[PDB]
């Protein structure tokens, strides 16, 4: 999280339920003005800080991009490790072959994948109660009203809904008394049968759906520009038409791509599983469909031949078994 700091330069103190004091570090980024950051992985940074007793200063990314190959050169966060403006990357950054040939990754924080987020627009009382269905109701009562003294005139209406002799007519009424039951019995199951029509909410079941492989102008697909999902779709020749024309709808950041979905302006959003699932919990009006298809994790990137290669990948590996990475999970991700 990134929030502006107070007037005095130290941002406001928060106390989640019991919680203990919330841990906040002063981020200095975009000109440039200081801020303060709350963090899931920042609570992980402060843990690594005390173990190897190294001090730190945190500054935001210059351009807000994750990183990819330009033209011959890297951009975003990767453009600041190689150059020398940073010695570590504490942010959700997936592991893949292209990045692994230039930096070192350690072991993942958490294991996840990536999915697709779409609208969850999920909305008659008696739809068939019209046309001949309603017309036949009036005809039956009117015909029997003068079938044959006025006591039986209201009898037909009352006998239709529970309740309130002329020999042949008495038997005729008796046999017709059960006739009202069968006709209304179908009505009871008519709406019951009409209650299971449902709607096609299975808009996109993974990549292998025919809509993705054959994109139509009705559907608009998007991701975040210069990220790992962009790389994943430029590795496969059979998907050369996937983003041949759907590349121009790529969004700048995942913060505003989700807002586009809720504005009925975007139809599909492909991004990390650990992020979209959390958003679906808060919003309570979106949904994630499909299945995970590229399983990797978030690791601490650090420049090649760095002398902290073994230290970091052991504390992360130990923290899973202590339960520390589960205490963070409940306080930050899976609560509601």
């Amino acid at each position: 999280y990134v929030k502006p700091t107070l007037s005095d330069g130290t941002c406001k103190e928060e106390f989640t339920v019991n919680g203990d004091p919330v841990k906040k570090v002063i981020c200095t980024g975009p000109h440039t003005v200081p801020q303060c950051c709350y963090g899931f992985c920042i609570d992980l940074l402060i843990k690594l800080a005390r173990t190897m007793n190294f001090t730190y200063e945190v500054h935001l990314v210059a351009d807000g991009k994750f990183g990819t190959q330009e033209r011959k050169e890297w951009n975003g966060m990767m453009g600041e490790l190689l150059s020398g403006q940073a010695d570590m990357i504490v942010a959700p950054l997936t592991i893949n072959n292209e990045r692994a040939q230039y930096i070192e990754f350690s072991k993942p924080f958490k294991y996840q994948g990536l999915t697709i987020l779409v609208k969850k627009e999920i909305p008659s009382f008696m739809q068939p109660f019209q046309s001949t269905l309603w017309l036949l109701v009036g005809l039956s009562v009117h015909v029997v009203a003068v079938m044959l003294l006025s006591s039986a005139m209201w009898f037909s209406w009352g006998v239709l809904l529970n309740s309130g002799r002329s020999f042949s007519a008495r038997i005729l009424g008796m046999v017709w008394a059960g006739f009202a039951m069968i006709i209304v019995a179908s009505y009871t199951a008519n709406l019951a049968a009409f209650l299971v029509l449902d709607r096609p909410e299975e808009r996109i079941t993974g990549i292998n759906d025919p809509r993705l492989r054959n994109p139509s102008d009705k559907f608009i697909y998007a991701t975040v520009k210069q990220s790992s999902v962009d790389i994943y779709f430029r590795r496969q020749v059979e998907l050369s038409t996937m983003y041949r024309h759907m590349e121009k709808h790529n969004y700048e950041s995942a913060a505003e791509a989700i807002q586009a979905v809720r504005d009925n302006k975007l139809h599909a959003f492909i991004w990390d599983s650990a992020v979209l699932e959390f958003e679906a919990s808060q919003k309570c009006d979106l949904v994630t469909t499909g299945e995970l298809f590229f399983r990797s994790g978030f690791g601490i990137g650090m420049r090649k031949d760095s002398p902290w290669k073994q230290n970091v990948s052991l504390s992360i590996l130990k923290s899973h078994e202590n339960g520390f990475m589960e205490d963070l999970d409940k306080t930050w991700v899976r609560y509601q």
Partner: peptide
């Protein structure tokens, strides 16, 4: 719902005859 009217028609002819 053509069958539903058929039952009524059969019912109507039942008492009429």
């Amino acid at each position: 719902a053509g069958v539903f009217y058929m039952l009524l028609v059969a019912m109507g002819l039942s008492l009429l005859v």
